Amino acid sequence: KLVFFAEDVGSNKGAIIGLMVG
Amino acid sequence: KLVFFAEDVGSNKGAIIGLMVG
Amino acid sequence: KLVFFAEDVGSNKGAIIGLMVG
Amino acid sequence: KLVFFAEDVGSNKGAIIGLMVG
Amino acid sequence: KLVFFAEDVGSNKGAIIGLMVG
Amino acid sequence: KLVFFAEDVGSNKGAIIGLMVG
Numbered sequence: 719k720l721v722f723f724a725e726d727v728g729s730n731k732g733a734i735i736g737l738m739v740g
Numbered sequence: 741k742l743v744f745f746a747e748d749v750g751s752n753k754g755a756i757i758g759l760m761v762g
Numbered sequence: 763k764l765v766f767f768a769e770d771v772g773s774n775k776g777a778i779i780g781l782m783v784g
Numbered sequence: 785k786l787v788f789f790a791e792d793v794g795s796n797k798g799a800i801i802g803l804m805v806g
Numbered sequence: 807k808l809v810f811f812a813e814d815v816g817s818n819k820g821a822i823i824g825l826m827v828g
Numbered sequence: 829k830l831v832f833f834a835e836d837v838g839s840n841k842g843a844i845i846g847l848m849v850g
Contacts, residue, residue, distance in 0.1 A: 720741070720742050720743070721743045721745075722743065722744050722745065722825075722849070724745070724746050724747075724749075724825070724846040725745075725746075725747045726747075726748045727748070727749050727750070727844060727845075727846050728749065728750050728822075728840070728844040729748050729751045729752070729753070730751075730753065730776070730838060732754045733754050733755045733756075733757075734754070734755075734756045734757075734837060734838045735756075735757045735760060735837075736757070736758050736759050736812070736815075736835075736837045737759045737834060738759075738760045739760070739761045739832075741763045742763070742765070743765045743767075744765065744766050744767065744803075744825055744827070744847070745767045746767070746768050746769075746771075746824040746825040746846035746847060747767075747768075747769045747770055748769075748770045749770070749771050749772070749822060749844060749845070749846045750772050750822040750844045751771070751772065751773045751774070751775070752773075752774045752775065752776045752778065752816060752838070753775045754776045755776050755777045755778075755779075756776070756777075756778045756779075756815060756816045756837060756838040757778075757779045757781070757782060757815075757837075758779070758780050758781050758812030758813075758815045758834040758837050759781050759782070759810070759812060759832055760782045761781075761782070761783045761784065761810075761832065762784045768803045768824035768825060769824075771800060771801075771802050771823075771824045772796070772818060774794060778794045778816040779793075779815075780790030780791075780812045781788070781790060783788075783810065785807045785808065787809045787810065787811075788810045789809075789810065789811045790811075791812075791813045791814075792813055792814045792815070793812075793815045793817065794815070794816045795817045795818075796817070796818045797818070797819045798818045798819050798821050798822070798840075799822075799823075800818065800821075800822045800823075801823045801824070802823075802824045803823070803824050803825045803826065805827045806827065806828045807829045807830065808830045809830070809831045809832065809833075811831075811833045811834070812834045812835070813834075813835045814835055814837070814839045815834075815839065816837070816838045816839065817840075818840045819839070820841045820842045820843050820844070821843045821844075822843075822844045822845075823843075823844075823846070824845075825846050825847045825848065826845070826848045826849075827848070827849045828849065828850045
């Protein structure tokens, strides 16, 4: 019996912003 | 018995913004 | 018995915006 | 003068694949 | 004068794959 | 004069893979 599991690889759940200006 | 599992690869669930200006 | 499973690959569930201006 | 430009947003130029077997 | 420019946001130019087997 | 520039945000130019087997 052989099992391979991979999850959440190179995923974005947060926030990525180049820049922010008020 | 062989099992292969992959989930959530290079997916975006968050927020990606180039720039934000008020 | 052989099983292959792949889900949620290069999918967008969040929000992608080039730019935002008030 | 006001200029707004955006390009290549949420676009795929490469290759996306769920799985492959030889 | 006002200039806004954004490029290559959330874009894939490489290769994304869930899994592969020889 | 005002200039806003952003590039290559949340973009993939390399290779992302969940798993691979020989």
